[PDB]
């Protein structure tokens, strides 16, 4: 249930400097959206895993990991905290250890729960890996926005695929419900869909907030970056065609490959989730 | 001898309908360039693998795979053989079996040599999959050029990464010289640099042939695709920036990963190869 899930995310969230209520709220709303979409398929893996679709401890840990990702993003930008504080947080979340600086106890606590709940501990090691990748991409994008020289579209998109965090969302679901992502990752086509869906998410997100960012003066957005470098280029039309192109590619792969449940529906729910559905 | 290697690629090429002298000559020119650039490293790995950089059997098979790639590209673009023949050739090469139609016995000879010579057989299967991706990309780019809808820059580049065939080249080198590409592929960063170097080869080639194409009525090229879909866009400026961005990314990952020899030098040699160094030269003289 929504309001309750939210309260539980909010109470854990109190042990993190810079945590806002919308962190919990966006987390629950986006996490709800995904779970509802994969529920029918998830119920099919239960019998094998012993992990129930509606298990309250699993669901709330998932929402807390989502809020952590939203919070971390804000830390890097709204500047809720310092590069030192952020570096300590990064080490805690990326290695699974107590944070060496005060004010971020919720970090060791969430990671500890994830470690204990992991169906396949490999997924926990993977999640730490994905966490370091995601925070490094937040830091790189943030620094690039005020750097002496501008990134190419290729660099932005590549970084944007890591900072959209879909890899993290998938890892966390596999960890909790035993989705065997480690095995799927051995498949090139699975890796390609992971990048495709992340790029779709990065592009939908940027196209959605470009007007706001344009007025506000925000350069960590594909539309602004391209408009700054290529004033004459029809940037929005281009990015929209890019989004359409990645979506077509994802469709060809999906139609050609068959991924064990619930990956097919998980992939499609992420492909469809817009940023306006939870922000 | 350079000429003896050309003749051994040619003799084998005689068992491939549509094979031209130019396919052999450009293969040896491009293949020699690559082998020269990584020669000191291969001397280094030869102690552990038992595969000599000077072994003529390995060199000639490598050049024959390159000639195959040049021939296949021409078959797709100049209609050297029929659509029915190309499909049979592609099936034979993608599964590593004899061609079902006659006139292509070289497909069987080459695939069987690769199978026999493979240091790590996982590279042989990889080479078959790369061959399949390669021929499919060549066809897809040809088809999209008269298709109803133009694809996005993103589709073009994904296809273009398969059509430049760097993956095939690397795999063939690992196959013959025991370079462990199948093991290194377990590293995400290794797979990332493979995609970067291919994209770099594709952007470099396209920024070079856009005036050749535009002239001949060829829309299968990034500069042409983008100018057609976005006439006001500074396409050449954008693509050069993309190329420089992919290069900066490649340099950063290579510097972090410290891949084992000869991979750094191999990636660098491909970054530097100019079509100028192998294609351009050969073309059978005609009195005019």
UniProtKB/Swiss-Prot annotation, chain B:
Gene3D superfamilies registered for this protein in UniProt: Farnesyl Diphosphate Synthase
InterPro entries the UniProt entry points to: Isoprenoid_synthase_dom_sf (IPR008949)
Pfam families noted in UniProt: Terpene_syn_C_2
The name this protein goes by in its record: Uncharacterized protein blr2150
């Amino acid at each position: 249930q929504t309001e309750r899930a939210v309260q539980q995310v909010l109470e854990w969230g109190r042990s993190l400097t810079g945590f806002a209520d919308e962190h919990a709220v966006e987390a629950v709303r986006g996490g709800q959206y995904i779970l509802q979409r994969i529920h029918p398929s998830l119920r099919g893996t239960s019998a094998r895993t012993g992990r129930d679709p509606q298990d309250e401890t699993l669901i709330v840990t998932f929402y807390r990991e989502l809020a952590l990702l939203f919070w971390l993003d804000d830390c890097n930008d709204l500047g809720l905290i310092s590069p030192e504080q952020l570096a300590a947080v990064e080490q805690a979340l990326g290695q699974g250890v107590p944070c060496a600086l005060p004010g971020f106890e919720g970090c060791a606590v969430l990671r500890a729960s994830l470690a204990t709940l992991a169906y396949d501990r490999r997924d926990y090691a993977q999640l730490l890996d994905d966490t370091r990748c995601y925070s490094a991409a937040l830091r790189a994008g943030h620094a690039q926005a005020v750097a002496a020289e501008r990134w190419s579209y290729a660099e932005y998109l590549h970084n944007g695929i890591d900072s959209i965090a879909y890899a993290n969302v998938f890892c966390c679901l596999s960890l909790l419900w035993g989705l065997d992502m480690a095995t799927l990752r051995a498949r090139p086509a699975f890796r390609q869909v992971l990048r495709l869906i992340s790029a779709i998410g990065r592009l939908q997100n940027d196209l959605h907030g470009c007007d706001k960012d344009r007025s506000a003066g925000e350069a960590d957005n594909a539309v602004i970056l391209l408009l700054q470098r290529y004033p004459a280029m029809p940037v929005v039309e281009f990015l929209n065609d890019e989004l359409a192109g990645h979506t077509r590619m994802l469709h060809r792969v999906m139609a050609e490959e068959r991924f064990p449940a619930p990956w097919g529906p998980l992939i499609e729910a992420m492909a469809a989730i817009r940023v306006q559905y939870y922000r």
